[PDB]
């Protein structure tokens, strides 16, 4: 058919968006990361060399994926460079791509941790790199089976970088499940745990409230010295154990009030040791001023401990949801790729070919959005665009 002109002329002017609006911000967006990190000693802890991690990763996407990825649609009609250089890109591109999203599994699983056991700490140096270990390696063991198969190359040197249903159908199917699917389950486990972790431990800080708060009237109303012995032990009871549920002001110049239980529990210790001697009398006395312990430091502790661990789960959960759903048009449409056979795969491939960069600025700015929420990091930010740094 000569009326039928399949020019496939041009498509430059994608590349420039893509560079523009996907490439640069990507490239960018985690070297201020790794920048932030790297030379701001406020900001060096177990947490962030984790998160410098990711910001490797989702940097070395535009770095070398992405970039090689734009030739693809410049020439899609053949490889153009070394055929040695298809396997390694496409092992790069499943390597990466799958660490940025692990990457995130890990941190939605450490900060749920963090709220169900503040208590361990200093999460050392030890346990990140463990955790940074194990997740390249999770990444590695699922792009691994791209090199080791190979492309489909006697031969022209034509060649297509590309996964084909024949070839690696089953690779498509399992290799989406443990990269993306699996991930995507546990966070979605780990939402509802932290959804009963912040309310138990809410429900916990209210009865801790009203147990100090019953026994006061208990050493007021007391008669007996036994009354206002195991009335103040309950105290400190209850006022270490609504202590424990944050962790220590030594793991933030303006006001500390966790310290408000070490001035509760020393007064508690006083008050007890004259209801050891037997001064009952000057014992009730030193219970009614825990009273203004209570009021300045216990009072405004509870609130700020429940509102704040809610509003940065809150905002976690938000920006690990964007990057979710912004790779699902992907992996969706990468299964049924496989699973149907009905549908046209000449333009389910074509969509394939729109979905990664969709996904690729959801890995690629994803550390950057993420950080800004932190003001020392903005703040770092800040400086780094206007090139001042120290
Ligand atoms: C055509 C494209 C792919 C190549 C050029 C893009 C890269 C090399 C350029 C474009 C914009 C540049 C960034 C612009 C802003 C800053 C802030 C500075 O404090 C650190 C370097 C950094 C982060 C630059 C790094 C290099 C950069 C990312
Ligand atoms: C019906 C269930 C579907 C979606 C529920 C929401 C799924 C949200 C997926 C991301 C949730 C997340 O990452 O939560 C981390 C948590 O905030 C800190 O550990
Ligand atoms: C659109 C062009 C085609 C060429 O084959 N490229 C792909 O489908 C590429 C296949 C990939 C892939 C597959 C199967 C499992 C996976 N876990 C992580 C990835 C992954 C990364 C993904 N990259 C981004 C796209
Ligand atoms: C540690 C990583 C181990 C987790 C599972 C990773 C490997 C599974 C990869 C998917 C199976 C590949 C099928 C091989 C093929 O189709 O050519």
């Known amino acids: 058919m000569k009326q039928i002109v399949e020019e496939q002329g041009n498509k430059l002017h994608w590349a420039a968006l893509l560079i523009l609006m ?36 989702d940097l070395l996407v535009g770095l070398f994926v992405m970039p090689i990825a734009l030739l693809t649609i410049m020439f899609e009609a053949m490889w153009p460079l070394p055929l040695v250089l298809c396997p390694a890109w496409l092992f790069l591109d499943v390597l990466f791509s799958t660490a940025s999203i692990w990457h995130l599994c890990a941190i939605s699983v450490d900060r749920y941790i963090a709220i169900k056991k503040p208590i361990q700490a200093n999460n050392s140096r030890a346990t990140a790199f463990i955790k940074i270990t194990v997740v390249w390696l999770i990444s590695i063991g699922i792009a691994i089976p791209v090199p080791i198969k190979g492309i489909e190359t006697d031969n022209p040197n034509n060649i297509t970088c590309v996964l084909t249903k024949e070839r690696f159908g089953d690779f498509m199917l399992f290799g989406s499940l443990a990269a993306f699917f699996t991930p995507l389950a546990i966070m979605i486990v780990t939402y509802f745990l932290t959804i009963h972790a912040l309310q138990k431990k809410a429900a916990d800080l209210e009865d801790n409230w009203e147990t100090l708060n019953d026994n006061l009237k208990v050493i007021e109303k007391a008669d007996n010295a036994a009354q206002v012995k195991d009335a103040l032990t309950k105290m400190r009871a209850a006022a270490l154990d609504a202590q424990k549920a944050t962790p220590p002001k030594l793991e933030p110049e303006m006001k500390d009030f966790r310290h408000g239980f070490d001035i509760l529990v020393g007064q508690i210790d006083d008050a007890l040791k004259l209801a050891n001697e037997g001064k009952v009398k000057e014992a009730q006395a030193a219970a009614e001023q825990l009273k203004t312990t209570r009021n ?29 759903l912004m790779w699902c048009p992907f992996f969706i449409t990468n299964i049924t790729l496989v699973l149907c056979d009905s549908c046209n795969q000449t333009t389910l491939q074509m969509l394939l070919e729109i979905f990664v960069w969709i ?17 020392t990091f903005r703040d770092a930010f800040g400086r780094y665009i206007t090139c001042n740094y120290r």
């Open 22 to 57: 996907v490439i640069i911000p990507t490239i960018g967006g985690n070297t201020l990361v790794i920048l932030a990190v790297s030379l701001e000693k406020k900001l060096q802890y177990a947490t962030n060399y984790f998160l410098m991690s990711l910001a490797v990763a």
């Open 359 to 375: 996904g690729y600025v959801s890995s690629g700015v994803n550390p950057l959005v993420y950080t800004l929420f932190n003001k």
């Open 296 to 324: 300045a430091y216990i009072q405004k502790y509870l609130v700020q401990t429940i509102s704040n661990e809610q509003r940065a789960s809150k905002v976690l959960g938000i920006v690990f949801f964007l990057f979710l």
